[PDB]
Amino acid sequence: PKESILKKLEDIKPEQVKKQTKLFRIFEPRQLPVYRANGEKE
C-alpha cells in the first residue's frame, strides 16, 4: 500500500499554533474569617 505511506506525509500539517484566551491561574483570593489574639471574631 504505497499510496498509504504517501498520504500520511501530505497529511502532516504544520505545528498547531496555540494562543491562550485566559491567564494561567493557580491561586485565587478567598474570604476567610479572622480572629484576634484572645480568640473571638474581629
Partner: protein, 73 residues
C-alpha cells in the same frame, strides 16, 4: 449485494411511473462527482502514445458553488 438491492428497489418501482426524467436524474451528479476524489497514484500516456505510471499526489479543489450545485442535484 445489499448495495445493489437498494438501487433495484427504488428503480423498479419508479420506472413504472416516470419513463422520461428518471434516467437523467440518477445519472446527473456523476459529471460532478468525478471532480471530488484525490489523486494518489495515476496512470499516464506519453506523447507518442504509450503507457507509463506516475505517482503524483494532486489535491481535489472544488469551490462552494459545486457543493451548492450538488445539493440541487
Amino acid at each position: 449485494s445489499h448495495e445493489d438491492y437498494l438501487i433495484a428497489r427504488e428503480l423498479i418501482v419508479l420506472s413504472y411511473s416516470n419513463r422520461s426524467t428518471l434516467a437523467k436524474l440518477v445519472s446527473s451528479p456523476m459529471s460532478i462527482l468525478v471532480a471530488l476524489v484525490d489523486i494518489n497514484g495515476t496512470f499516464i500516456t506519453n506523447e507518442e502514445l504509450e503507457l507509463e505510471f506516475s505517482n503524483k499526489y494532486v489535491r481535489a479543489i472544488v469551490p462552494d458553488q459545486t457543493f451548492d450545485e450538488l445539493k440541487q442535484m
